[PDB]
Amino acid sequence: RIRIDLPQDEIPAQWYNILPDLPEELPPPQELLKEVLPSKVLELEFAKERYVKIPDEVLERYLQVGRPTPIIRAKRLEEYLGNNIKIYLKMESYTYTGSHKINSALAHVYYAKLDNAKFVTTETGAGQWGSSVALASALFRMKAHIFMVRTSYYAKPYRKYMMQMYGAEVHPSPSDLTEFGRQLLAKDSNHPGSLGIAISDAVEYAHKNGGKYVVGSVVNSDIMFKTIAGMEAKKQMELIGEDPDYIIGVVGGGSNYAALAYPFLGDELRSGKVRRKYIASGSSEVPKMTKGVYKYDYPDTAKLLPMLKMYTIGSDFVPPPVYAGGLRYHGVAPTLSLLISKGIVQARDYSQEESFKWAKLFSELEGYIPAPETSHALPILAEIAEEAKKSGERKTVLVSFSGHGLLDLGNYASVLFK
Amino acid sequence: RIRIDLPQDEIPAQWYNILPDLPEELPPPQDPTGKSLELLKEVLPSKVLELEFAKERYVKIPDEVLERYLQVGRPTPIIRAKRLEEYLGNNIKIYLKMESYTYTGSHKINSALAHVYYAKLDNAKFVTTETGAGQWGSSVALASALFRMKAHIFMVRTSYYAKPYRKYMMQMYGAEVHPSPSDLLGIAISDAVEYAHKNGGKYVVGSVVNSDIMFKTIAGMEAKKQMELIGEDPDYIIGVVGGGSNYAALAYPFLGDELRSGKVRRKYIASGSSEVPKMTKGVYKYDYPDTAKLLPMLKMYTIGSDFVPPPVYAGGLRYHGVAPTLSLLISKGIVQARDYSQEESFKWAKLFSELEGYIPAPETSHALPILAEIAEEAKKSGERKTVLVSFSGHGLLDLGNYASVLFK
Numbered sequence A: 001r002i003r004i005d006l007p008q009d010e011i012p013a014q015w016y017n018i019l020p021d022l023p024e025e026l027p028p029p030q031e032l033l034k035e036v037l038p039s040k041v042l043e044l045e046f047a048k049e050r051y052v053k054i055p056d057e058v059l060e061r062y063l064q065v066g067r068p069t070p071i072i073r074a075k076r077l078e079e080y081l082g083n084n085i086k087i088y089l090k091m092e093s094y095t096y097t098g099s100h101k102i103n104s105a106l107a108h109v110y111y112a113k114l115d116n117a118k119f120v121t122t123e124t125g126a127g128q129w130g131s132s133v134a135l136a137s138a139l140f141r142m143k144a145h146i147f148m149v150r151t152s153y154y155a156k157p158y159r160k161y162m163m164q165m166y167g168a169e170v171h172p173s174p175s176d177l178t179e180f181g182r183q184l185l186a187k188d189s190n191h192p193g194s195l196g197i198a199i200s201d202a203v204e205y206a207h208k209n210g211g212k213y214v215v216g217s218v219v220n221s222d223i224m225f226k227t228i229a230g231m232e233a234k235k236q237m238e239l240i241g242e243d244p245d246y247i248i249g250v251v252g253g254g255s256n257y258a259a260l261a262y263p264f265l266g267d268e269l270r271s272g273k274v275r276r277k278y279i280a281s282g283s284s285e286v287p288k289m290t291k292g293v294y295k296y297d298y299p300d301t302a303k304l305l306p307m308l309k310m311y312t313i314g315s316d317f318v319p320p321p322v323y324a325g326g327l328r329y330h331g332v333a334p335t336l337s338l339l340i341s342k343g344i345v346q347a348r349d350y351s352q353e354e355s356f357k358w359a360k361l362f363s364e365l366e367g368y369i370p371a372p373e374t375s376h377a378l379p380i381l382a383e384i385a386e387e388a389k390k391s392g393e394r395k396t397v398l399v400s401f402s403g404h405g406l407l408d409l410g411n412y413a414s415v416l417f418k
Numbered sequence B: 001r002i003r004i005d006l007p008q009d010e011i012p013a014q015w016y017n018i019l020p021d022l023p024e025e026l027p028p029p030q031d032p033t034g035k036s037l038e039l040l041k042e043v044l045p046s047k048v049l050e051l052e053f054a055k056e057r058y059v060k061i062p063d064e065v066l067e068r069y070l071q072v073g074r075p076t077p078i079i080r081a082k083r084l085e086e087y088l089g090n091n092i093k094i095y096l097k098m099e100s101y102t103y104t105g106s107h108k109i110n111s112a113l114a115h116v117y118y119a120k121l122d123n124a125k126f127v128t129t130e131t132g133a134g135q136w137g138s139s140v141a142l143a144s145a146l147f148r149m150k151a152h153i154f155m156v157r158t159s160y161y162a163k164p165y166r167k168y169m170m171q172m173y174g175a176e177v178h179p180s181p182s183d184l185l186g187i188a189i190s191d192a193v194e195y196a197h198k199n200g201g202k203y204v205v206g207s208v209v210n211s212d213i214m215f216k217t218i219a220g221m222e223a224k225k226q227m228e229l230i231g232e233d234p235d236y237i238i239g240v241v242g243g244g245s246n247y248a249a250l251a252y253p254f255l256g257d258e259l260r261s262g263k264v265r266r267k268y269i270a271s272g273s274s275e276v277p278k279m280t281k282g283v284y285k286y287d288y289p290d291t292a293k294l295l296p297m298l299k300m301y302t303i304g305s306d307f308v309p310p311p312v313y314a315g316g317l318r319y320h321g322v323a324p325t326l327s328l329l330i331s332k333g334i335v336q337a338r339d340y341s342q343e344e345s346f347k348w349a350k351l352f353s354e355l356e357g358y359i360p361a362p363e364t365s366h367a368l369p370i371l372a373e374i375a376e377e378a379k380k381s382g383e384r385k386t387v388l389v390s391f392s393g394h395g396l397l398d399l400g401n402y403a404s405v406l407f408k
C-alpha cells in the first residue's frame, strides 16, 4: 500500500505560473541576453497566463525520463516518529538523472532547438545541472557543450562521466575555447575556475558560435517548468483522497520546493485563504533562508542576468570548505522570497551534521539514500510530529524528495565516515 | 505508454521452483573432503538449505519478505525501448524488465531479503557475505538494515578501493565492510564462509544455488503478468549471466509453462563476458563453488574456481561458474549461450544511454549485443520479433568502470 503511481497516459499537460495568483505583484527584475537565450524562455519570464501548455515534444521526453514519478509513503519513518503524521514523498529522485532538474532542462533544450540552435551550452560545478542538460540534449539530439569548473572537473568525476555517457562534450573552465577563457589561462594554465567564470565561458561560446545558453537559475521560467512535479502530485494525492496539511522541501535556489508547492498554494491563494503550512529549509552554513537580506541582487556570479529581488547573503558568499551539504547557492527565487516575506512560506535552516544524521536514519529505515540536499528537509518532520501530537488529529505531510544521493556518497562519507 | 506498471496490490505472492519441471534430474552436489556439507549446514540458513531441493512448484512468499519487496520498489516496471527499436530499424519490439528500479539498483535485493529473513529465523547474530561489484553487498546491507540484522561484507578488494561509493553505500545502511582476502574471488566467498563459522553467524549466498534463483523469480512472475497486461507474448527472453540468477529469475517462470506444456517455442539467449568466458568456453563439469574448497562441488559450466579476471576488465560478470539448473538447460540446447567483450558491450551501453536516457550496469550491457543480433536476424527474415530483456541493474555507481574503457 505504499506507492502511488500516476499512469503515463494521465500525466498533466500544462505547467503552472503562480505570478497571476501572487498576493501582490512580483517586484520586477531590473542583452546579448537574447542572442544566447532561447526566445520562448525570455517570453515566459513575464508570462501573465496562469498555465503554459507543455509542448507534445516535451511531454514525450518527460515520459522517456521516468515521469510521472511515484509518491511513496514512508510508513517506517511514520512509526519511528510515533504514527502522529502521515508522510508522503514525491519522488523526483526517480527520474533517470536522479533529480528534479531534468524537468526544466528538457524544456530549455526544447526551446533552444525551436530557436534552431546549433548546440546548447551551460555551466556546472558539482555536475547536477550539467548531467541533466546532457540527458535532455541527448534526447533531443542536440549537441551539448558543458563548461565545468576545472576544480570540480577533476574533483567530482562521476557526474562528468555521466555527462559523457549521455554524449555531452565537457570542458574544464576557464577553457581555451573562448577569448575570456584563454585570457585567464594566460594568468594560470591550470586556473581553478569558478561558477561565474564557467557562466561567462558558456555564454561566450554560444554567442560566438551560433549556439544557445541554457540557464539553470531561479528565473521564473525555470520554476514554471519544474511544476510538472506539483501538477502530478496534486493529481496523485487527490487520487488517494489525501489533502496535505504540510508541504515541505529544501531550498538551493528554491525551484524544487516551489515546483512541488506552488500548484497547491495556487488553489489556496485563489480561494483567498491559506490553510496549509508551507515550510522550506536550507543549510545554516549558507543561511539565506533565515539570515538573508531581502533585496535586489545578482542571480548569478557572472553578473550575467539582471538583478532580482530576493533573499540573499550576497553573490560572493562562499561556504566553509567543510560544507558538503550541497545547498551552496546564495539566494532564493524571487517568488519564493516574496512568499516568505509575507509569512506564507516558513523558513528553517539546519546544520549538515543534523541533516546527515537524519539522512542516515532515513537510509536504514526506509531504505533509500536521499541526496544531501534533500536531507535538509528531514529535520522539519520532527517539528511537525510534535505539533501534530498536540492536534489530536493525524496531519499529512507532503515532501519534495528532490533527489537520491548515490552520486553524493562521497559527501556523506566526508562527514559521517570521517 | 512506454512504461507498464504493475500495481503493488497485484504483486505475485509466490516464488517459482523449476526443479520439478526440468527435462531431467539435476546433477546432485558432490562432496569429497567430507567436511564441506555439514559445514554448509552450519553456515547456511536452515530453511534456505531446505528449499534447495524443494519439490513444490510454487513457494509462498513469507509475509515479512513480501512487505519489504513492496518497500524497496517492487513490482518493477517494464519499459518499452522505442528509441532503441528505431535505431535498430523497428525490426523488433524491445521490452525491458527494469530490475534496476529497486532501491539498490539491481535484482540482488530480491534474494537478499529472503536470505536475511531466513537467517533471522535461525536467530543468527550476524550475516556474512562476499561481494564483487558491490551490488550484492549493498543489497545485503539494505536487507540487513530492514530486518535489523548485523552484516559483515567481504568485498573483493580491487573492487573495495576502486568502488568506494559502493562501500560508502553499505556503510550508510549500517553494514561493516571488509577487504578480501581479509583478517580471518572466489576467495571472498571463502573469506565470508570462514568468518561465519565463528562467531555465531550465518552465510548469505547471492546466486548460483536453487533457493537463491527461486527467490529472484518474483521478477519473472511479475513480468509474466505485465506482458499479459498488454497482450504481448515474447519471442525471445534474454539477459546476462554472472552466476546466472538474474537471467534464470526472469526466464524460468516463462520457460516452466513451456516445459510443462511439452513444447519450447520461445528463444532463450544469455550472454557472459568474453574476458570471463565460461558461457561459451567453459566446460560442463563438477567444480568448486568457492576458491579454497570448503563448499560442496556442483556441476556447472565452469572455467575453474581459480580463474582470475584481467586487470583491464571492468565489465563485471566475474564469477567462474554458471548455476547448475541453467547449465543443465544450456547443455540441453534449451538456452543458447553468448559472450561479448567489454569493449563491445560498453560501446552499446553508451549508445543506449544517449538513446533511452538510462545508464545500464556494466553487467547488463552484455545483453545489448544480443539485441543487435536478433534485429539483424529479423531483418533478414522480415519477421518482427518481440524481445523481453532482464535489465539487471543501473550503472550510476559504475561510471568509473565505464570511464576506464570509454573516456580514454
Ligand SMILES: Cc1ncc(COP(=O)(O)O)c(CN[C@@H](COP(=O)(O)O)C(=O)O)c1O
Pocket: B106, B130, B131, B132, B133, B134, B135, B136, B137, B206, B207, B208, B240, B241, B242, B243, B244, B245, B246, B247, B315, B316, B317, B318, B319, B361, B363, B364, B392, B393, B394
Ligand atoms: C548489475 C548486475 N547484473 C547481473 C549480475 C550477475 O549476477 P547473476 O547472473 O544475476 O547472478 C550482477 C552480479 N553482481 C555481483 C557479482 O559481482 P561482479 O563484479 O562479478 O559482477 C555483485 O557482487 O554485485 C550484477 O551486479
Ligand SMILES: Cc1ncc(COP(=O)(O)O)c(C)c1O
Pocket: A098, A099, A100, A128, A250, A251, A252, A253, A254, A255, A256, A257, A327, A371, A373, A374, A402, A403, A404
Ligand atoms: C537533489 C537536489 N536537491 C535540491 C537541490 C537544490 O536546488 P533548487 O532548490 O534550486 O531546486 C539540488 C540542486 C539538487 O540536486
